Write a protein that binds this ligand. Structure first.
Ligand code: PC1
Ligand code: PC1
Ligand code: SF4
Ligand code: SF4
Ligand code: SF4
Lengths: 318, 80, 97, 70, 150, 376, 115, 171
């Protein structure tokens, strides 16, 4: 009966992506002193359905100069990669109980850029090439910091399993002994998912649309849902990493309620962040992450290496 | 050295903070009192099987029962 | 506790629109559920309301009819169904209805 | 006013509640009322295979107690 | 096929995506329409800069002789279905600069225009009325019924 | 392109991604106003000036009216002068709101655009109440203004000017102290005073470079010498100093608006010489001379003595001038429009040397450029 | 096995959407909708010209720092080792080598940009 | 007369704490959240309309006397003052000898809506009326003849007369 579990994992996150678009437009209007979409349905509840049907009855409009192989291969790979790393998340019991789920998340997150590169190179245009180059620079910036953030936060967990991450929260949150690393991790999740002020690929003022500027409707919606599943899942991962809740084996309802509310609040905070700051230049992206973030996280990494030896607090690996 | 420290704290505080954390992480475990406690905590974890030994009749330390007072105890971690 | 007053205002907005049927009708048609002082009505069926407690621009509004000049206007409400006297009143050109 | 976003976002809450809960409920069906036996190393797998080999129905979740022996 | 026609007409008319094609005074009037006072985004109308992901195009300003190939290429790169909304008087019939040597006398000569919005500049409420008229024009489309009859 | 102002063709030689040669190809909005002007009389050529700079409409009207009144050797009544100065300051606030908010949108902060476009709509409503059109008023005419202010408008102006400084403070908190906004404009687009004057720059650019020059303080017009206000002066030539200068110019515009509202004198709104200004509709239908003058003014147009003049006003973008040459007939012989945007886009090549492409779009944003004015 | 089933189901759902997006609606193509997008004008040359990219050393040293990460990554299980002094000393040594490489990059003008 | 914009351990520690803990970013976020909790200024179009003025320049109309007889007397001042040359007038005396018009065409795609004709008319015949919601679908529908202008005048007389009564003393 794993098929039913897989379907119930993969369909409601797509529905969550659609209603994330709804509340995205609503809240993003609301801090701009205007209302959101509320004409189509009662408080605009039918906006995602109209958006989804509208993109799928348009014309795909494949370009002549585009190499059709990677042009048709990039969005499906993007949607699959945004979908395939949801499994090791404990919810409170994960789909697949992998001992090294952090490594799986890291490797499938490294794979997620390849759809952007193949969509940039497959379409023959200068804007797609510039978007691919900026995505490459964004990956250069964020990977070498994000790996060390995850390792140094994970050093008190004792193992790479995400199931044992819920055990460590039973006394106190790990955001209290690792609040600077929490700031580093939040900026890194801002940078990875390509959300403002770290967008730099789907630019409106710099480029037209960047990596998918030649992508018409149908294939374009896959990148949209992939990015929104990415941000929802990344906020769920941050919630599990730093603000893990109280788990009771006899009632999973408590933990589902708690992490759902916490991840929803973190996504609202992400929406709050994404439209209050100017967009960064991509030359200042590695003038910050390679210059200010890296020495600080090296110092904190060696501090978290030498800290359980200091206090005699070596965590168990099991 | 105060003027130079004030200058680097005014220009880039991140480097000063990083070097302070690095120096603390270098010099504090060499002054820690619980490092040997970590040593015995790691050494006392029973990973593999504690196989017994043959008897020639002359051993004052090893016991014949796990509950015998002879042999090493683990009271220090129980109290801590 | 002021939140109980907000819930009271919500239930009075539910009750004052003729009930749940009128509440759902105005919700699906006008996308608004505010009650107001009925200024009047015209010969076609356009009911013109006002409420001076709202801010400027939202202090005068109109609920359109359901059948004007033969067409079904339950969903295809147009901005040019206002007679000239009510056109003068509605766009805030004078204070005299 | 502002609280009008509070309906729609609530729907997203349901969209963040239906998956994970379902997995837990699925874990309360295929495992005979208990949780799924989390296997992480070779000895946990050996114990689970021991339950599978002793249950006689080729199901590990059918746990037999001290009443099985005489 | 009558009800399926009613569905896809509702999906296209409630998620119109215009493109950022302004040229003159009338572009500033469009930006004034997109202000919180009138709030285009409440109608399912969100600005998208790329022609490949846009539904309609509102030509705001004066279309000169140096601009006709650009407008023609931008219109030709939009995916079907596409609608063009003329705006102001410059894009309607030339308007003030109708007799000039370097102004196209109405943008109908370059692109097929669906909705004519008159003004100089037209008021943002009138522009919202024109967009609602375009939505009502989309609503009464009869694609699948005509396909079934043919 | 959203960062482009609708009509622009920047061809750049990207050396990887930095610019070595940038060339603005323009003329996509060349309507040819200066040929259509000479085929129309002065009253008919007045609304042509509303559409050159379509964020600074009343200032262009004031420049054209000042040129025609200097040629006609007539001056408006003082109430008309105070009305012109008040609506020119409202126009300056309009232009500065549009320029700052569009620059912040082109850099990436998209909230103050929606925050102050409702205030821009409020001033559009003020234009609606005073002239009858939301944007193209055609209100300032040679001889003063066209109509008197309606009853109850000035209380609305006072209330809006009272409540607008909080919005200015909100914007200045949201952008000035932001580190991301700062780091885009620390040392970008630096210009020197010698290259400011030699490249024909006027207005904020000069005040960005420390040059102390303002046409409202050195060569004043109608009542600007009777109003006390400050002039911001930059110190580095970057875009940051120009943005700060624009914000301070908004604050001084509020100050001038308060001084205007506390000092409006009673009187008439047109020049009482009926051979230039049209007569009132009450006395047109009773007096024969007024009917004859109305007929010939709205059919032929008042004659202007022959000669050439070049007047210049302090437009919100800089110095807006017109070279008007009249041959004695009711139509101008040659009307040339000098604009700050032409020289600013000419100096864009020098100001953008050695920067990344995002800094080029920042330099494009930091020049308040309206391309209808640039292409005329 | 379950990972393979999840991968196959995800790929099936992904590739079913594009097929629905392609073969369901009516296609109508000419030789202008397939043209490359250059803001309404013809493209100047092709996009296959070599970019004069300026962060080549940053990409190579990203690779090298990722291999530093690969050396530093099995550190948590080393927390269960007996010889703790050598563990701590050499984890500090490897982090110090990473910092030495970064500091040499900082001093010798490597983190900046060309031209 | 002039001012200098941008000419300005505890302070260094405060700046470093602002760098590390993001004080002014929190301030800007607080102002964003302040604007989240206010009442949005979106008016419910088309059930609500924006404020206007009695001087509003909208749709062209031809008025009439309060006896049924039309107001235009074929004086051709509107087509002589029109800056866009959008007005075409052809006139002849009708059967009773009254100087009237036979053709009065306004090209509304040429008209710039500047109200010179509504102020140059000696008998207040042509009026830039108040209607702004008159968008069409075809280009020829925006090309009014005399019959359409007379129909617009008879349609909107009931508010055009009131607007003229309210505004005529400022002229
Ligand atoms: C995950 C939980 C929630 C997290 C918070 C989420 C809500 C708040 C989000 C705020 C907005 C974030 C996005 C916008 C900003 C993006 C840019 C950015 O972050 O730039 C980073 C900025 C960039 O700095 P900058 O932009 O000022 O750079 C200027 C640099 N100089 C001065 C050289 C010219 O800061 C850093 O890079 C610093 C890294 C974080 C520092 C954390 C310090 C923790 C404490 C250390 C010890 C302190 C005590 C002293 C030593 C004691 C030793 C024993
Ligand atoms: C979130 C889920 C989204 C799912 C997808 C979206 C939901 C709706 C799916 C069906 C939409 C309608 C059919 C596809 C779009 C057709 C667009 C259109 O106008 O087609 C006109 C065309 C007819 O026009 P045509 O064939 O003359 O071509 C128009 C183009 N010219 C004239 C230039 C050549 O419709 C069809 O071809 C019919 C398609 C099948 C209709 C149903 C058949 C019976 C099914 C049982
Ligand atoms: S129609 Fe009028 S407002 Fe619009 S661009 Fe032309 S002159 Fe400007
Ligand atoms: S409003 Fe102006 S442009 Fe229009 S018809 Fe009258 S005079 Fe001509
Ligand atoms: S100005 Fe008036 S009376 Fe004269 S021709 Fe025109 S509409 Fe007729």
């Amino acid at each position: 009966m794993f098929m039913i579990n897989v379907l119930t994992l993969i369909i409601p996150i797509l529905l969550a992506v659609a209603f994330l678009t709804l509340v995205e437009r609503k809240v993003l209007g609301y801090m701009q002193f205007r209302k959101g979409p509320n004409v189509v349905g009662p408080y605009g509840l039918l906006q995602p359905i109209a958006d989804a049907i509208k993109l799928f009855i348009k014309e795909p409009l494949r370009p002549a100069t585009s190499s059709i192989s990677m042009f048709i291969l990039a969005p499906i790979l993007a949607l699959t990669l945004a979908l395939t790393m949801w499994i090791p998340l404990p919810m409170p019991y994960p789909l697949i109980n992998m001992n090294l789920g952090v490594l799986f998340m890291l490797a499938m997150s490294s794979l997620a850029v390849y759809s952007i590169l193949w969509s940039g190179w497959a379409s023959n245009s200068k804007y797609a090439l510039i978007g691919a180059l900026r995505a490459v620079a964004q990956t250069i910036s964020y990977e070498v910091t994000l790996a060390i953030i995850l390792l140094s936060v994970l050093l008190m967990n004792g193992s790479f399993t995400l199931s044992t991450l819920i055990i460590t929260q039973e006394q106190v949150w790990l955001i209290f002994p690792a609040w600077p690393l929490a700031m580093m991790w939040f900026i890194s999740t801002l940078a990875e998912t390509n959300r403002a002020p770290f967008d730099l690929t789907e630019g409106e003022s710099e480029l037209v649309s960047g990596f998918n500027v030649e992508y018409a409707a149908g294939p374009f919606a896959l990148f949209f849902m992939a990015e929104y599943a990415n941000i929802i899942m990344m906020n769920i991962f941050t919630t599990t990493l730093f603000l893990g809740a109280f788990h009771n084996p006899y009632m999973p309802e408590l933990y589902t309620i708690n992490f759902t509310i916490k991840s929803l609040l973190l996504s609202i905070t992400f929406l709050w962040i994404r439209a209050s700051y100017p967009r960064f230049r991509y030359d200042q992206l590695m003038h910050l992450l390679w210059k200010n973030f890296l020495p600080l996280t090296l110092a904190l990494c060696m501090w978290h290496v030498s800290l359980p030896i200091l206090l005699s607090s070596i965590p168990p690996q099991t | 050295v105060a003027a130079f420290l004030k200058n680097v704290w005014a220009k880039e505080p991140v480097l000063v903070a990083s070097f302070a954390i690095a120096g603390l992480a270098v010099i504090l475990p060499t002054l820690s009192p619980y490092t040997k406690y970590s040593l015995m905590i790691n050494r006392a974890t029973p990973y593999n099987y504690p196989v017994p030994l043959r008897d020639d009749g002359n051993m004052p330390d090893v016991p014949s029962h796990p509950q015998d007072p002879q042999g090493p105890s683990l009271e220090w971690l129980k109290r801590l | 506790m002021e939140l109980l007053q907000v819930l009271k205002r919500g239930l009075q907005q539910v009750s004052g629109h003729g009930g749940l049927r009128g509440y759902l009708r105005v919700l699906f048609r006008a996308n608004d559920v505010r009650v107001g002082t009925l200024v009047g009505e015209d010969k076609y069926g356009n009911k013109y309301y006002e409420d001076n407690k709202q801010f400027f621009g939202r202090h005068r509004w109109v609920i359109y009819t359901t059948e004007m000049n033969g067409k079904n206007t339950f969903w295809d409400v147009d901005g040019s169904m206002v007679p000239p006297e009510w056109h003068r009143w509605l766009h805030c050109m004078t204070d005299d209805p | 006013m502002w609280f009008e976003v509070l309906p729609g976002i609530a729907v997203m809450g349901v969209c963040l509640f239906i998956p994970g809960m379902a997995t837990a409920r699925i874990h309360r069906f295929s495992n005979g009322g208990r949780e799924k036996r989390v296997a992480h190393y070779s000895y946990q797998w050996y114990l689970m295979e021991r339950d599978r080999r002793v249950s006689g129905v080729n199901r590990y979740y059918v746990s037999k107690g001290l009443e099985n022996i005489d | 096929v009558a009800k399926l026609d009613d569905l896809i007409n509702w999906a296209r008319r409630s998620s119109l995506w215009p493109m950022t094609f302004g040229l003159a005074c009338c572009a500033v009037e469009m930006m004034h329409m997109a202000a919180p006072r009138y709030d285009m985004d409440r109608f399912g109308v969100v600005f998208r800069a790329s022609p490949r992901q846009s539904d309609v195009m509102i030509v705001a300003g004066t279309l000169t002789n140096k601009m006709a190939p650009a407008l023609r290429k931008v219109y030709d790169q939009m995916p079907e279905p596409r609608y063009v909304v003329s705006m102001g008087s410059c894009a309607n019939g030339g308007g003030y600069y109708h007799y000039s040597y370097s102004v196209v006398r109405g943008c109908d000569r370059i692109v097929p225009v669906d909705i004519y919005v008159p003004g100089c500049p037209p008021t943002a409420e009138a522009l919202l009325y024109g967009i609602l008229q375009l939505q009502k024009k989309i609503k009464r489309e009869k694609r699948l019924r005509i396909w079934y009859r043919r | 392109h959203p960062a482009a102002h609708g009509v622009l063709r920047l061809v750049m030689e990207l050396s990887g991604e930095m610019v070595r040669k940038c060339d603005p190809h323009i003329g996509l909005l060349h309507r040819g106003t200066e040929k259509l002007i000479e085929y129309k009389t002065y009253l008919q050529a007045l609304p042509y000036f509303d559409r050159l700079d379509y964020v600074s409409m009343m200032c262009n009207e004031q420049a054209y009216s000042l040129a025609v009144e200097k040629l006609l050797n007539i001056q408006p009544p003082p109430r008309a002068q105070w009305i012109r100065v008040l609506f020119g300051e409202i126009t300056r606030l309009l232009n500065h709101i549009m320029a700052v908010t569009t620059h912040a949108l082109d850099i990436g902060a998209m909230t103050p655009f929606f925050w102050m476009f409702e205030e821009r709509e409020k001033m559009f409503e003020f234009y609606e109440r005073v002239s009858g059109a939301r944007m193209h008023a055609a209100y300032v005419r040679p001889g003063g203004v066209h109509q008197d202010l309606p009853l109850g408008l000035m209380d609305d102006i006072y209330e809006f000017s009272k409540n607008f400084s909080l919005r200015i403070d909100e914007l200045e908190e949201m952008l000035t102290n932001n580190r991301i906004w700062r780091n885009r404009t620390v040392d970008i687009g630096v210009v020197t005073a010698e290259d400011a004057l030699n490249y024909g720059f006027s207005g904020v650019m000069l005040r960005g470079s420390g040059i102390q020059w303002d046409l409202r303080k050195t060569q004043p017009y109608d009542v600007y010498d009777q109003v006390e206000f400050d002039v911001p002066i930059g110190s580095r030539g970057d875009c940051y100093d120009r943005y700060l200068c624009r914000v301070e110019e908004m604050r001084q515009s509020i100050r001038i608006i308060s001084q205007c509202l506390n000092k409006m004198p009673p009187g008439e709104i047109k020049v009482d010489d009926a051979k230039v200004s049209p007569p009132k509709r009450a006395e047109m239908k009773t007096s024969m001379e007024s009917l004859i003058h109305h007929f010939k003014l709205y059919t032929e147009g008042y004659q202007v003595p022959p000669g050439a003049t070049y007047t210049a006003i302090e437009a919100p973008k800089g110095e807006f001038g017109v070279y008007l040459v009249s041959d004695g007939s009711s139509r101008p012989y040659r009307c040339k429009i000098k604009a700050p945007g032409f020289a600013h886009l000419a100096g864009l090549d020098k100001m953008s040397k050695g920067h990344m492409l995002a800094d080029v779009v920042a330099i494009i944003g930091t020049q308040d450029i309206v391309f209808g004015e640039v292409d005329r | 096995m379950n990972l393979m089933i999840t991968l196959l189901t995800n790929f099936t759902l992904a590739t079913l959407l594009v097929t629905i997006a392609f073969w369901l609606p009516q296609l109508n193509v000419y030789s202008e909708k397939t043209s490359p997008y250059e803001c309404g004008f013809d493209p100047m040359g092709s996009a296959r010209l070599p970019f004069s990219m300026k962060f080549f050393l940053v990409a190579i040293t990203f690779l090298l720092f990722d291999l530093e990460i690969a050396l530093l990554l099995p550190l948590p299980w080393a927390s269960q080792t007996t010889n703790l002094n050598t563990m701590l000393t050499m984890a500090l040594l490897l982090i110090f080598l990473l910092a030495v490489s970064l500091a040499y990059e900082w001093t010798q003008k490597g983190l900046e940009w060309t031209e | 007369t002039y001012k200098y914009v941008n000419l300005r351990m505890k302070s260094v520690t405060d700046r470093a704490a602002q760098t590390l803990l993001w004080t002014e970013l929190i301030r800007g976020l607080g102002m964003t959240l302040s604007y989240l909790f206010r009442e949005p200024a979106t008016i419910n179009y088309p059930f609500e309309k924006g404020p206007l003025s009695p001087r509003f320049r909208g749709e062209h109309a031809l008025r009439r006397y309060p006896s049924g007889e039309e107001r235009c007397i074929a004086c051709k001042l509107c087509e002589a003052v029109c800056p866009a040359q959008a007005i075409t007038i052809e006139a002849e005396p009708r059967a009773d000898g009254s100087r009237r018009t036979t053709r009065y065409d306004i090209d509304m795609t040429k008209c710039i809506y500047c109200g010179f004709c509504q102020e140059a008319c000696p008998v207040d015949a042509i009026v830039e009326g108040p209607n702004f919601e008159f968008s069409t679908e075809t280009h020829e529908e925006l090309l009014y003849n005399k019959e359409k202008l007379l129909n617009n005048g008879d349609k909107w007389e009931a508010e055009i007369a009131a607007n003229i009564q309210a505004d005529y003393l400022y002229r």
